[PDB]
Design a protein around this nucleic acid. Structure first.
Ligand SMILES: [Mg+2]
Ligand SMILES: [Mg+2]
Ligand SMILES: [Mg+2]
Lengths: 88, 101, 70, 119
RNA sequence: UGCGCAGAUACCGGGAGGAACGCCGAUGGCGAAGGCAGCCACCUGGUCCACCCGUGACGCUGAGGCGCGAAAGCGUGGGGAGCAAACCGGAUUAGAUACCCGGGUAGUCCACGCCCUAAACGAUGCGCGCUAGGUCUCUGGGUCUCCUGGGGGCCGAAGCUAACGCGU
């Protein structure tokens, strides 16, 4: 799983201001968490395809989110992908 | 690390030497895998509804217990290395859904 | 006649040990009784089938019996 | 040859032959009979008469060992069934209890295509 | 046909091994499809509701691309209980390369890799907004006769349709 605290830590390390749960940045972050967990489970459980569709969706939701950010504030985009290491 | 329930059914033909020898080895595994221990229960000698390992009765240990979850399969694998251990059944502890009221 | 829930008082039907209760939800062939006879809800009836099956593995309830007088 | 006082009559009904065997209280065969073991041969061994006859005849052979009472255990469906029971009951040889005990898998091997006409 | 006096069938005890999980079981449930059914644990996907807290149009569809895709089939290596194309026999028939009976290889199962098709069916692409109701049902929530969601069925206003039908 992803225990409530682990999640909570990430919302914290990413929220634009205190009380920020659902901004582009927190959202991208959380997906990235889910993805890396889900990807570790996939390098082992290669034949679990139903789960793998979940991935494709998360990877999309992410690119679609990031696409928006790069179009509004190309700045905190560059910062966010650096703080995570992605896309480029 | 979550809460569980380890049931063991044992050989119903033991004197206190054999009996508590097994009961100790158990406490070792339990301990040697991360288990702390809330309640114990020992109804012991009960008649099974069909004979397990040739034998119309069984000795019942039940433990509620908390432990590292990624080891609970390992624990139980070791619990039945023994021969006087006949059934080992481990189960996620649970809210007790009731009925009639 | 009676539904097996109409009989009892309150009980934990997540409790795979209480054979004194759980034993009443079986036929004389020790088969899990249908809803129409258990008087239970779809949801309860689901939970029970589970508890009954767990009992069977511990040795406390039967998988089968034989019909007496046919 | 020992005297048994009581024990088991096993009836094995089928849509092709009824067969009956009698045993001591640990299930060891004393005597036995079947449709073919009386005269009938081919498709008559199923008929409730064939069943009755076989049944009765087995009981007579057991009564030779002085058999006085039995628990009946019946297995399978077929024409001779209630008739082989009705027989043992009316053979003198006293019927203590009855019990169906037909095998049934909890979904085991693939049945032969004849038996999945219920496909 | 076959099997059986090298003692079968039927019965009691013990063991070995493979496949599939009775009752629960539904008009049920989950999944995008194909599809998913003993019980336990771990790892993991989707989804619904309530609160109305956060972002602030970040949306819909989607040629090509990629991935999934029942069954049968193919390659290598296992496994093999029951069932069974082909095949070998017994029947039936005017004949019977069939339907019925006795056997039986591939295959069905597991590992890894291919194939990529179907009455792959709701024969109904995906999304959104609008337009009477009644009834049964799964799963939520509330102030729990009932109300408010989300799913599953039937009947049917308006309207539609060659018709049969469809009809929140
Ligand atoms: Mg295949
Ligand atoms: Mg092959
Ligand atoms: Mg054949």
């Amino acid at each position: 799983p992803i225990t409530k605290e682990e999640k909570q830590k990430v919302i914290q390390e990413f929220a634009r201001f205190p009380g920020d749960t659902g901004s582009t940045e927190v959202q991208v972050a959380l997906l990235t968490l889910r993805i890396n967990r889900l990807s570790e489970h996939l390098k082992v459980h290669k034949k679990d395809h139903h789960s793998h569709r979940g991935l494709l969706m998360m990877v999309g939701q992410r690119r679609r989110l990031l696409r928006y950010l790069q179009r509004e504030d190309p700045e905190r985009y560059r910062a966010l992908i650096e703080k995570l290491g992605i896309r480029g | 690390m979550r809460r569980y329930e380890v049931n063991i059914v044992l050989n119903p033909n033991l004197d206190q030497s054999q009996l508590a020898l097994e009961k100790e080895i158990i406490q070792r595994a339990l301990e040697n895998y991360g288990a702390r221990v809330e309640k114990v229960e020992e109804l012991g000698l009960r008649r099974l509804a069909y004979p397990i390992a040739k034998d119309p009765q069984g000795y019942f240990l039940w433990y509620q217990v908390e432990m590292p979850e990624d080891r609970v399969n390992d624990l139980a694998r070791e619990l039945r290395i023994r021969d006087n251990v006949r059934r080992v059944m481990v189960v996620k502890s649970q809210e007790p859904f009731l009925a009639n009221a | 006649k009676a539904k097996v829930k109409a009989t009892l008082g309150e009980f934990d039907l997540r409790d795979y040990r209480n054979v004194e209760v759980l034993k009443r939800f079986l036929s004389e062939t020790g088969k899990i009784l249908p809803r129409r006879r258990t008087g239970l809800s779809a949801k309860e009836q689901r939970i029970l089938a589970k508890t009954i099956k767990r009992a069977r593995i511990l040795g406390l309830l039967p998988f089968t019996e034989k019909l007496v007088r046919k | 040859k020992r005297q048994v006082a009581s024990g088991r009559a096993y009836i094995h009904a089928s849509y092709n032959n009824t067969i009956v065997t009698i045993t001591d209280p640990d299930g060891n065969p004393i005597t036995w009979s079947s449709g073919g073991v009386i005269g009938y041969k081919g498709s008559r061994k199923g008929t409730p008469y064939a069943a009755q006859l076989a049944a009765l005849d087995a009981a007579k052979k057991a009564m030779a060992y002085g058999m006085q009472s039995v628990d009946v255990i019946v297995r399978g469906t077929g024409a001779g069934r209630e008739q082989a029971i009705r027989a043992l009951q009316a053979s003198g040889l006293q019927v203590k209890s009855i019990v169906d005990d037909t095998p049934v898998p909890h979904n085991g091997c693939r049945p032969k295509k004849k038996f999945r006409k219920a496909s």
